[PDB]
Amino acid sequence: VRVLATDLAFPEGPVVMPDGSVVLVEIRAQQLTRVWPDGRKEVVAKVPGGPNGAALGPDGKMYICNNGGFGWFPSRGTMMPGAPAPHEYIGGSIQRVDLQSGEVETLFDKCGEHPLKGPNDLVFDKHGGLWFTDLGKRRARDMDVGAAYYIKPGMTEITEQVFGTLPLNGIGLSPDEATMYAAETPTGRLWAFDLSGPGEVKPRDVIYRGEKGKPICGLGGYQMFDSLAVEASGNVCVATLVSGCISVIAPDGTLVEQVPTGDRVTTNIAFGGPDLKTAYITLSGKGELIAMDWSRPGLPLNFLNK
Template sequence: MPLETVTTGLQFPEGPIAMADGSVILVEIRRKTLSRVAPDGTVTVIAELGGGPNGAAIGPDGRVYVCNNGGLGWIDLEGGIMVPHGAAADYAGGCIQAVDLQTGTVEVIYTECDGRPLSAPNDIVFDRQGGFWFTDLGKENDTTRDYGALYYAKIDGSFISRQRDRLSWPNGCGLSPDESVLYVAETWTGRLWAYDISEPGVLKAPEVSYMPGRLILTLPGYQPFDSLAVQATGDVCVATGVNGRITIISPGGAQQEVPIPDFITTNICFGGADMKDAWVTASSTGILYKTRWDTAGLKLAFNG
């Protein structure tokens, strides 16, 4: 698939949202902002978020909900390549934020669950009931790391539930077309998990007690997974690092690959009238790409 460079110079872009006007809203993790990229590549800042804004999604009230990981450390390589490394020196905890697109007003919705602070919220997806699932990757430093977790919450701050605990690097998340399955990509293991949903916001108990869900696929070698998006067919498109690509995975575990020229390819989103316009964040190089996808993306519960 030929790639069009929409814009360059982004500060580690992630969490893209395709908007009806052709623009893309995304976070710039290193810049600590929610930004808008116009079709002509012009970048404007919507809000200053602080910490480390990561996954983002439109909620039922039209605001953008952001998983903020609390801030990352950075390594700068030759050629302007940016690589995240552990927690920022001023890391003070993760949170869920909501941003009014008209005013840029930022509200912190959640900082903890049942008295336990959020560590590093990473990715988010809304269901049709207006609640949202989100992953918490966990933070690490030179000697220790937090476990990750999987949460469900409501936008008014009234309810948050930890649905899975003691997970290893849960990153991208997305719902199947019928919302009966939550897919979660596990970063350093290169695994895609499926979690069966019994009712909105509640996961079924795992079929095997020592596994968090149903294992769909484990990639061979060292191929870390990042964020994901689901196609209308139900296949899952997972951004894949080191080799730089989008890995398209069927619910049965079959896979195909679309190469992307960045070893830290982090996310994909779909939009356009036929949902076949795709935007990909190439984060280490700070580029947003656009392409035409062979298969339509799944239309999300709430859209810009």
């Protein structure tokens, strides 16, 4: 276990480059940041609002889930995200950053007639379609439902694929891309959505209240999920809040293991390095990017690793 960088303002959305550098977002600093393996840092772009998740796109640009902004309040020695005051929330969107110029473009701020609320994380399929989660926003006495969306290849249009769940956070594709996984934050449940084809959830039979997917795993106790990354084996590695670990879930739902990280606010994971057997993990409470040896290889991401 190795600490690569410190003094990051709530790191998230790690994208591990082939050379082992990491481009990540700092939600509280509202920026996209390049982190080199020795700890030296460079700001790539200012991204006002709440840049929350990142993924390299087929056009070579860095696509960003912008949750619109958080309130920030001190808790357990860390500045934690909270419900934003109206003046702290500028609207959720999907954005794109030219890494060489720092230019930021806003691509979508609605799906149909409904504004996007709190876009969180995202993953590309091999065709260039873009899956992403919406965590929703919190307000003083209520909160938005979760959702998942798909933007068709070429960034032509956005469609609603999952709606009405609790806040959704991590999202990933199986190796064969026939299954999309969404992590539900407050319940610590990983939901598996069968796809009839690229970008299209195949609705499953309801279990209790309008479920479109299968809850293949739900952790016990007081454990919540954040973002995730998939292994070439098909296992889903989910950053686990409160207990502070990576939860490795097999495609069948089995809890393979839990890898402690030392931070109750462990938020994301991404694979890179030789054989993609290195796990790069954002400890957002401590403000750190860490590296860890992984026993199995990561799933190469489209347009970054393959």
